[PDB]
């Protein structure tokens, strides 16, 4: 499992979304987590929405096993569908 995060270093809710993946990475051995800047790196929600195939407006901006999965919102609901299911 590979989970990739676009822009931690820029806002607290994006950090919380990153931290959720890192927290899961702490909890298990299957689950690997990756952080990539967008505000530093010169990337934006206009780039991310094209790559993802879906018009995005705001954060979070996460991908799981190379696929777009929102982040803190999607990820909490996804984690819940496993651990609270």
């Amino acid at each position: 499992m590979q989970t990739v995060i676009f822009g931690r270093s820029g806002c607290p809710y994006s950090v919380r979304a990153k931290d959720l993946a890192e927290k899961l990475s702490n909890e298990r051995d299957d689950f690997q987590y990756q952080y990539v800047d967008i505000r530093a790196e010169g990337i934006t929600k206009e780039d991310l929405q094209q790559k993802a195939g879906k018009p995005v407006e705001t954060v979070p901006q996460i991908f799981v096993d190379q696929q777009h999965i929102g982040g803190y919102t999607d990820f909490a609901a996804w984690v819940k569908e496993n651990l609270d299911a």
């Binding site: 809710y13 919380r16 990337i43 934006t44 929102g70 919102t73 909490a76």
Partner: peptide, 25 residues
């Protein structure tokens, strides 16, 4: 006159899925 602008918080910090935050470059 001379004032400060403050935001009240009725909800708790509960960790479960806020979908937005307008963050970028």
């Amino acid at each position: 006159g001379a004032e400060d602008a403050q935001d009240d918080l009725v909800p708790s910090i509960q960790d479960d899925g806020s979908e937005s935050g307008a963050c970028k470059i």
